[PDB]
Amino acid sequence: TQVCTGTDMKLRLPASPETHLDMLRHLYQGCQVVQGNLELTYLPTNASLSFLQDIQEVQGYVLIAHNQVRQVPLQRLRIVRGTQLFEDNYALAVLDNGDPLNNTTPVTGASPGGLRELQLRSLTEILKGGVLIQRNPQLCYQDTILWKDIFHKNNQLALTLIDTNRSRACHPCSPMCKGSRCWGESSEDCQSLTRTVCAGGCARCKGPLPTDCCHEQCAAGCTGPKHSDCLACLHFNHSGICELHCPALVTYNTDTFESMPNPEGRYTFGASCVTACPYNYLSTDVGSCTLVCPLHNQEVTAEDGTQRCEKCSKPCARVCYGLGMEHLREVRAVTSANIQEFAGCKKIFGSLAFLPESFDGDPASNTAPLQPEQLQVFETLEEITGYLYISAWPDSLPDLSVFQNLQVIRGRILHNGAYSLTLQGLGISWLGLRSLRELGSGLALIHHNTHLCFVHTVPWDQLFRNPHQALLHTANRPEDECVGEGLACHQLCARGHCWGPGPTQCVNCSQFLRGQECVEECRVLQGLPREYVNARHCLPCHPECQPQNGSVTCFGPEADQCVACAHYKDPPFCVARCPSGVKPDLSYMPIWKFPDEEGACQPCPINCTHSCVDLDDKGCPAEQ
């Protein structure tokens, strides 16, 4: 896919180095449009950074900090849309990218740690925010840059905080450069001016000729002067055409504005017009893919299995909120207080962050660590939206066995813009989420678990959706001793897929099941009960069904399908005792029914409207 979503961490440190690097690589492998932010921090020396060559447009902001690699290739980058800015002031931040200036005495011929020279030959647009460059003890040429050319005329915040201190005598701009403002020493690094050398009123142009003016809806430079020839669409890119609005999906007559579906309808996703919304987002009636349904509009699963927001006539159902969703917005974790709102929540919305305080208490709030026997709140939950943080579990629980019915987690709310799970600080031994069958979006980290197996075995790929998702191993208990001890699935588990030890958890198994365990076989003729097969389920025969091995005991659950009733026949049913009949619809027992010779629950020939005291030897009321 050409569209990914970037991280959101600002200056928080990596969860792990050997995980952070691969996190970047999985997030930006072949991506061309980066929705969300773009963050590069604590990049070690000799970093690959090749996966960045094909990034063209950034929809958030660019952050680079505390780096020791000497060059970060971002040539094909063109436009920085600045949707959400760094510190609400910056859209391109490059700071501290050099040695801490403490000791770090370089040996002979050693390049000191720090970005040698910016190299961005096609970055010629910034739609908002400013530039923040400082504390770069090896950067060159950053001052000889005409930034106001890079900025956009609407970006009135043309505020730059640029520093010039350096410890190396930078080589002069190569003579081929014009204006002596060069990104680098090589001849092709001279800045291309597209905002100081255009015609009168031309925002962008190919060159200093009054026919080089770009169309009114391009971004930076143009191959041709038609709106289909932009290097980057300003507002919407509908099928290679730069338009101002995606075509509406309903036509209204000018008299009644009656809604007639328009086959040429387009939904909006980022700065692009998409015919149908992507997998995880929701299509609303107003015509925009989103994540959270608006007010008085509720999730409804469409006929084709997709989801969409539908209008409510009656008040929409009582959706059981989680955390960080609507009104528990800044609520961090679940105490014993909010947990009570989670009674009868088959579907939850929002995160459930679990800081260690949840299981270590907070004296100021008078909240004890929540009980390991306080988890019954989360038992009928079947769908969570957003992530599911975990950094405290009870030791009495050997795992996260609590959520046996959570069937769907969707990644509509990720932890840092990146993470849909997390398993860090735990001491658990497995998972046991036997019913989690879909994991919408975002990487799932399982981090710093010293007692954990069942991560090299979980059926991953069958849960993810896009190629961009990836799952990251770190500090997890070694698979080598996991196998040696034998923390894997068992034979019935199809394809070696599982979640934890014991035959309980298998996403799939060859033989049948009797409710919570894949079986070796059903008990049809041999077996303590008698069970008939249905959807590979061994439903037990009715107790009245006489267990007659050698013949099919039953053909169903009700009494009618027993091969031969054990005791008596009240046709068409099997009974252990021929019940005393009743005359009316309203309850009244005159007896009036006796078992026959072979079990036919005969009615009593005798009738006693007066309820005669004398009782026939058969049980009938004997007439006085």
């Epitope: 509406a248 509009n297 006539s313």
Partner: antibody, heavy 119, light 108 residues
């Protein structure tokens, strides 16, 4: 907290032109077709128009169908009501509102702009 | 052009009593009522939708009812804070017009 700061309300001659700007804030802008509703002095409510940000489409009462324009600048969360072909009976307070479902009952309202028209 | 009218023109009533406000439409609408309460000089506040269900957060001191072409708002216990204008608006057919007004004043 949802809040729609209307602005641009000032004196303008009859049959003139003006540009009201309703800077929204506090909610996802592109998920609620917004509406413009004018309350005259000492009168009941009217309903001028509504606009859907993604399409840019406009639906207005017939009496204004040839005089008012609706535009969206989704880059700035604004929403421009281009008022044109004015008249004496145009003095109003133009509450900028949000449709709850795209079904024309509003809940969140601006404080209004005493758009005054007179020579 | 559903001329959605209301009555009484004025509803003078002291604190803590029971009073009614009637909205009758020009035509028939199954459930298309949105009742609004407006303060004297501020933004109108949504009160009722679908003619029966109270808006989120609105005090349960009252709740209208009705359908078709007759709807009503019934005060259970009027208080000093609920002395302001009210209207109905039909969100069913073109062009979605509002009511006309029914003030509330304490009798003395």
């Amino acid at each position: 907290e949802v809040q729609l700061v209307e602005s641009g309300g000032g004196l303008v001659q009859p049959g003139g032109s003006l540009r009201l700007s309703c800077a929204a804030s506090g909610f996802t802008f592109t998920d609620y077709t917004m509406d413009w509703v004018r309350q005259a002095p000492g009168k009941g409510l009217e309903w001028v128009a509504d606009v859907n940000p993604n399409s840019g489409g406009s639906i207005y009462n017939q009496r204004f169908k040839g005089r008012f324009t609706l535009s969206v600048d989704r880059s700035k969360n604004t929403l421009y009501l281009q008022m044109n072909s004015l008249r004496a009976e145009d003095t109003a307070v133009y509450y900028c509102a949000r449709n709850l479902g795209p079904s024309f009952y509003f809940d969140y309202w601006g404080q209004g702009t005493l758009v005054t028209v007179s020579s | 052009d559903i001329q959605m009218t209301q009555s009484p023109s004025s509803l003078s009533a002291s604190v803590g009593d029971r009073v009614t406000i009637t909205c009758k439409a020009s035509q028939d609408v199954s459930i298309g009522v949105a009742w609004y309460q407006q303060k004297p000089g501020k933004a109108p506040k949504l009160l009722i939708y679908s003619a029966s269900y109270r808006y989120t957060g609105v005090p349960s001191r009252f709740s209208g009812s009705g359908s078709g072409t007759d709807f009503t708002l019934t005060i259970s216990s009027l208080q000093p804070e609920d002395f302001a204008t009210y209207y109905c608006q039909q969100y069913y057919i073109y062009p979605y017009t509002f009511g006309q007004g029914t003030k509330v004043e304490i009798k003395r």
